[PDB]
Amino acid sequence: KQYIISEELISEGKWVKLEKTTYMDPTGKTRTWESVKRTTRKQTADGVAVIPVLQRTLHYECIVLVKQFRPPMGGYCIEFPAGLIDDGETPEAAALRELEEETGYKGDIAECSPAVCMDPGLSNCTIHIVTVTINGDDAENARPKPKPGDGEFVEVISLPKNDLLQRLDALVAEEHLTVDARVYSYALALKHAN
Amino acid sequence: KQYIISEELISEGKWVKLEKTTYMDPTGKTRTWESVKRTTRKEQTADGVAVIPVLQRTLHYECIVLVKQFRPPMGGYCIEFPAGLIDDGETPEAAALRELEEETGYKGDIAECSPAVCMDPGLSNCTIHIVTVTINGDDAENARPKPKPGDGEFVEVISLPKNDLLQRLDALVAEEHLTVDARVYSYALALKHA
Ligand SMILES: CNc1ncccn1
Ligand SMILES: [Cl-]
Ligand SMILES: [Mg+2]
Ligand SMILES: [Mg+2]
Ligand SMILES: [Mg+2]
Ligand SMILES: [Mg+2]
Numbered sequence: 001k002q003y004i005i006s007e008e009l010i011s012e013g014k015w016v017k018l019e020k021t022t023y024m025d026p027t028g029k030t031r032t033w034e035s036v037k038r039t040t041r042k043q044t045a046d047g048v049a050v051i052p053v054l055q056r057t058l059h060y061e062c063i064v065l066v067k068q069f070r071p072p073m074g075g076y077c078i079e080f081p082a083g084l085i086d087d088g089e090t091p092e093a094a095a096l097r098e099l100e101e102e103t104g105y106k107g108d109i110a111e112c113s114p115a116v117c118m119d120p121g122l123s124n125c126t127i128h129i130v131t132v133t134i135n136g137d138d139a140e141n142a143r144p145k146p147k148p149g150d151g152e153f154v155e156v157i158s159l160p161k162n163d164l165l166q167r168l169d170a171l172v173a174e175e176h177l178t179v180d181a182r183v184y185s186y187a188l189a190l191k192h193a194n
Numbered sequence: 195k196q197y198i199i200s201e202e203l204i205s206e207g208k209w210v211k212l213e214k215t216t217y218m219d220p221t222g223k224t225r226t227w228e229s230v231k232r233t234t235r236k237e238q239t240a241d242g243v244a245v246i247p248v249l250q251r252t253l254h255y256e257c258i259v260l261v262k263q264f265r266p267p268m269g270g271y272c273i274e275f276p277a278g279l280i281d282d283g284e285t286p287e288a289a290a291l292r293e294l295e296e297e298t299g300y301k302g303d304i305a306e307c308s309p310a311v312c313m314d315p316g317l318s319n320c321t322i323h324i325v326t327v328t329i330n331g332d333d334a335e336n337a338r339p340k341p342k343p344g345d346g347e348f349v350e351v352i353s354l355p356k357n358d359l360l361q362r363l364d365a366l367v368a369e370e371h372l373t374v375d376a377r378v379y380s381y382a383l384a385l386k387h388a
């Protein structure tokens with residue numbers, strides 16, 4: 001019933017462009033929308049986010065998170081490890097790669113979502129969410145070696161899964177970080193379960 | 195260590211603007227970024243709210259209430275938590291309850307309210323509060339509820355058992371061409387992973 005009529009470029013950077021979308025509303029009336037897209041999509045999705053489940057025996061199961069300065073935010077954010085999927089990379093491989101570069105952990109794929117939207121009232125950005133377990137007891141994850149890209153500077157934060165939401169709230173109150181919305185959602189559902 | 199040096203307006207619509215962001219990296223080097231912001235954000239603590247609406251009824255499994263809308267930036271229909279921007283001088287809780295009733299017809303009761311969390315912090319500064327709300331589906335007010343949506347709003351309500359959220363979302367992805375929001379998918383995965 002609704003669909004896109006045309007997309008007018010307003011402005012195009014190296015990474016991000018702004019368009020004005022014309023669309024047919026369900027009443028038969030033409031309407032416009034200001035839309036953001038990345039200029040880098042190729043790929044099933046722009047990116048991947050990894051839910052990394054750090055499993056070490058006789059320890060609480062942890063969820064591995066990253067903290068970075070996010071220039072659009074103008075401060076530091078706590079997020080699942082993530083990046084853009086390389087041209088002709090699979091989502092699963094972007095996930096393991098990004099997870100390694102950002103945290104140094106070597107993990108195994110548990111499952112992989114379809115492409116899901118990040119902020120669909122604003123942008124077309126999508127990601128695959130990739131659940132990955134990390135055998136914290138293998139020698140390769142003993143002193144995990146984070147190999148960041150150029151211009152990435154990432155702190156690694158492992159929080160117990162069974163207390164994640166309370167832990168995140170503690171971090172925000174005590175540290176002025178912003179928690180990612182997907183991370184916060186995950187944490188909520190851990191509490192809302194059962 | 196890192197911080198914003200300056201912010202240069204590249205392009206401004208009625209709703210979104212693109213900015214060139216200059217910042218100090220942790221080595222001491224000046225770098226730039228292409229940042230998106232909304233033009234609508236006054237003194238609200240976040241741009242918007244997303245509502246996690248738990249529909250509770252005697253001798254029913256709990257249901258998560260979701261909305262399906264056409265999203266111009268995506269060129270298609272998306273399944274998402276009920277959500278809208280926070281009006282000037284409105285609290286996140288009021289906005290959450292208002293949007294939920296507007297988009298679904300349900301009158302909920304506040305349960306909890308997150309801090310401001312970031313939507314896509316590598317791309318935008320956009321933030322929401324995620325507001326958890328319980329819906330007493332035994333109250334007569336919530337029996338045959340009508341969405342009273344705004345101008346340009348055309349929303350379908352979809353209620354899914356919390357206990358089978360992830361598969362029910364998958365079954366919808368398999369049946370039509372549509373995208374699940376990443377916050378919704380994160381929540382559904384954590385329900386599974388608990
Ligand atoms: C974020 N873009 C937007 N918002 C409202 C109406 C039109 N475009
Ligand atoms: Cl798992
Ligand atoms: Mg990254
Ligand atoms: Mg990286
Ligand atoms: Mg809305
Ligand atoms: Mg609305």
